[PDB]
């Protein structure tokens, strides 16, 4: 055969651990590129971002050299990674118990030693979610690619010469804004220095799920508490309303506690609003109890009207403070 | 033996990476067929469709050639895939961390080099679910099969010559409509072009689960709110009803939020209806509070009757807008 | 040694892929037996039945032959399956991503070529659950064993000669009735025919869990709705009862929706009973609202009594329709 | 080297399948000991007991013999199990898909052939939980260790000579009582007999979790129903109380159904008590409805007092029946 | 090549099991260091602490010796662990079924035999959580590193010479306080002694999640019960309030039972407070029932006022007992 003849004369003394270089002091310019093709999910229960992405590798090789003219062309050979040298580049923040590479069993090589291994991975990364703007947030996620084993004396992890990765993966759940990747030198200690590549994926929330399960029932309960103090205390239904509002706000807290995770850096604004409808039922229940105790002059109507006006201006300033997000 | 004699003279210099071809510029017509035998599940929490399917492969081989007449027949040999060449065809949208394969340890070969490897897989695919018609949807799922490693210069991923796959797997949960598969040339870049095969599985919802857990309690709460404004405000039970309707609609929202996932492209119509019963309770609670404040002329009966008529025509036009799905 | 001397002269040219036969047209009678020793679980969320079972294999061999008399007895040798031929028999309906096998690393061989490999597996099978009789069902489960790779021209998957597997594994959760296994010839196409073995495990429900979490609260709410219309409408508690019945039936629907899975072929009878207590609260709430509107002649007592009698006969005929299951 | 010289002359013809023995009719006394160091969890959803334990093995060897005096001592050599013979001892009731053995890559050998392989495993075992005493139960768990492959003609699975394993692992969740292990001969059939070792771990419940989430709210609802019939029926709050008791007992059933698993052999006593507070709320709601129908002579006070006394003596005899557990 | 020439003359007779030493009685000083870089999660459902950490290893070697001057420098060689000796150091409390290792496929070696293998792991450890201070706890976690296979006669697991690991990983969920690691000699038996290293990670709770889902609704329900007894019993709403308080406290118990795990050593103080609001509703419901029975002299106002004062002083002393934590 033709490919078998060249393959029998290119891995004669090739190990999967020898760094391909001519001079020991010389390094290898292992280029890298990250291309997220589809963001799978973002769960804040354990700060996990699952994406599907291509991890483009490109390093020069010294031993994979052949002349094409005596081998009848054959400028591209498909070589598995189990019989070729492989860099130890990994996610710095991995959530899986092990690092997995879908379709990582093949890698092309060129006639100039231009291995272009492109595996595809379900990357599970860790990002800091600023949930003070929840749900209408713009918290970017950073993915780190580097080698923990060898350092800048062995490899030089750089960005791709052509960095045309300024895409926008408009999904049905998030708006994805790609950031042009940067290179930073992470230092293990003072004497030794390493390399690393940061890529950024900004996520913009656009779904109307959280405006349906949280915002609309909370603003409707706020509207109900705003309409609460018009009922006279002698009707024997104001306290029943108030305790029904307590039960409804407790069910809203049950939904929020089952949905919003344990990771809090700042209190969410929907959680702050739920605290508000609560601190209202408590305040208007106190005023209703005091009104029905005073009823047993009819001064309570003016007190309820001024209380309604104060709650009106407080609720409208809280809702226009909330509306600055959207 | 007879099979051992032929097997000892067919893998003398066979590697698991050499592409079987005679001329380098020539390609191999790697045929493909997808046959879903049983759709396991469809979960919209992370856009996962789990199916059980056969992935029929058929490629011509150049090195697996023998004359049968001097080997006493033996037109079919069972050869494991670990000692034979294997294409790198995969799902383009895989949800598992690694590609699973059930019964992939054997593959038949013919005397003309007609390897017919048929593995079986639990394919976990990603589809775009148009949930605006939820639950009575007809959102098709697309499964993509292609090679990321080699391109049209090496293999040619084509359809089966006999494409008799127009079945209909009538299950107890979905109606499965198979679509005749098509071939599209996905391009990694401008200079290089690759191959891919799209197969389609249309899912028709036929279960009465979502008509029992969502539609019937929501239409019963709508019927209850329709019957609400007949109660006189002096009976001290209209506000109690209204707040009980608030609690019941909150429990319905709790069931919907625990069931309907975070992925929303459009608001579901059952979710829109749950918004309607909510906006009713709020509106009829406002009118009940204003009626019991006016009661403390008896004009409220005509107001409640016209309100009941307006709610009657609005509820019936909303239900006949809903009934166009079913 | 004695075993090492025979082992060094029995795997001289043995591969893990050569089918052991003398003539090519001859087949091998690969016998099979299934013995479920303990049914682990049955979850209807994805039609999964987890059992622990022995998969008895017995095939004649042509190459594993030795005379015992010159080897000092030694009629039984323990040989691992990694160095011996192995059939590709599998579950036709597997739920795991890969086929698991517990204690599959050893297999006895006899002096006549009588390999008796008995692995043990946690089989995850798929069955059609007729949930119209839920919870008091008798839906059998079918487990299929066959080879997808080779056909009746190579192996002949037959029953055990001694089929004494008519046991009864009486567990604390189910009653297990073993069915005598049958053999059917599944056909991949018209020209080629394959083999398969069906074994049956009938499951009888005997637990009092579903009679405690579903049947007793639903029949108690039905009893409460039966006792509902005796309250006079002027007591201002009939509508409160009715809405409390709505809340209780909604909590019952919440428990049922969180427990009963998405797979419905037919509506469960407990679900039908729940849709009935709901259709009652709705009907008696309508009659209570009309009675309190008519009260604002005292004809409502006779109407409530005839309504109570009609609901009495309807509830008793529904409960004696339900009682035919148990 | 010294260890390399002995290691190069001890595995010259050693396979991982030859049973180490001199005479074929002779057997090997493979001793065994189980030492649970920490019980991880016990979940009754699928009868799983997760423990961390040492599985001490000790078998005599015939081929691992050397004289120490010409090898400069070296009485202990660390040998991995991949290059030494290994018994096929396993859990008879395993919940994992495949057998795990954390720290199983090394095993010491002595100069007399005294291999002392001690792996450590997260054993997932199956026990029969007698939940009639739930939560204050004393249901022991049995762990079975035996070989399915070879029988008493090959190995003899016996106890340790020194059985000092009478410890007591006092944890924060359970009290662990070790049982001295026994040996039983499990029979695959009539002609052939095998060996097995039973070890027992008795679990005593001591946590106050289930006395907080179940016992205290149920006894408080029973106290509330005991205090229920003192309210006069003309106050229009007795029926509201009763339906609030129905809602509270329904929430208690929701907590119990979400916590107590589907496996029931007998009804739990806490489940029987929730059942009492229910049938109790039903009976006093019937008597309250009949009292408010009779009110529309004032004989109902004596009826309510005798009903309260009967409920008092019934509740106190039920609570002293419950108190015999604790 | 240069690296290939040295690599072909350094693993000539190297096995992955020979302990590298010159004299048999001599030991190897296998140093160790633990560096937690990011604490992933702490779940008390099964006492699991998931951290991401570096496990620094450093042992002297006897066989990995070369002179650099005739090899043109090359003081550092990257060698995979599959072809080099590896200590069996592990977590003593592991929650995973098998020991996972991220980037463990490479390890540097120096010219003096100074292997510096640094793998990175998602360590799942077990700690005793003193939940009597929940949520404002300071329960440290202990991670144990040692070898179960060989003992102090073979290796000597010691600290790093430079122990500069006094960092503080200030996260958004916990405050991490590193403890300087210590060495303890765990004994398998009396005759033999082993080695082990304890490292400590103290976790300080700083999130406001549990102050939002538990503390604020419980203190608001306590405030509501404090405001409860002012309502006159003739208003027919005191019993309705009390039963609404019962329903709200039951929903709070539902949230607590779904969140707080089964592992209890001591009752949490938030759980004790939830007991207090419950025992109040029960006590004030008893007093409300007795007041409405006495109403059917007006001495109940003074009784309610003294009851309110006693509940005021009891609630304020309970809240200032709670406030000592924060
Ligand atoms: C790695 O590449 C960067 C790119 O500018 C260069 O500045 C740096 O000197 C390189 N490192 C080495 C060791 O050559
Ligand atoms: C692959 O097959 C299609 C089928 O028509 C053909 O048009 C195309 O030219 C083929 N590609 C190559 C490279 O031969
Ligand atoms: C397989 O066994 C059945 C048992 O009766 C027999 O009828 C059939 O002919 C056999 N098949 C072959 C190919 O021998
Ligand atoms: C195995 O050991 C027991 C211990 O008493 C002994 O009774 C039995 O005979 C032994 N079995 C064989 C086959 O030697
Ligand atoms: C291990 O190191 C400690 C450090 O002080 C030392 O005391 C001890 O003797 C050493 N053990 C051996 C066996 O050398």
Author numbering:
A (entry chain A), B (entry chain E), C (entry chain D), D (entry chain C), E (entry chain B): 12 to 307, 414 to 443
Provide text from the study.
Cys-loop receptors are allosterically regulated pentameric ligand-gated ion channels (pLGICs). In this work, we studied orphan receptor Alpo4 from an extreme thermophile worm Alvinella pompejana. Each Alpo4 subunit is composed of a β-sandwich extracellular domain (ECD) and a transmembrane domain (TMD) made of four trans-membrane α-helices M1-M4.
Given that Alpo4 shares a structural resemblance to the α4β2 nAChR and the 5-HT3R, we investigated whether acetylcholine or serotonin binds into the ligand-binding site. To this end, structures of Alpo4 purified in the absence of CHAPS and with an added, 1 mM acetylcholine or 1 mM serotonin were solved to a resolution of 3.9 Å and 6.2 Å, respectively. The cryo-EM reconstructions of Alpo4 obtained in the presence of acetylcholine and serotonin suggest that neither of the neurotransmitters binds Alpo4.
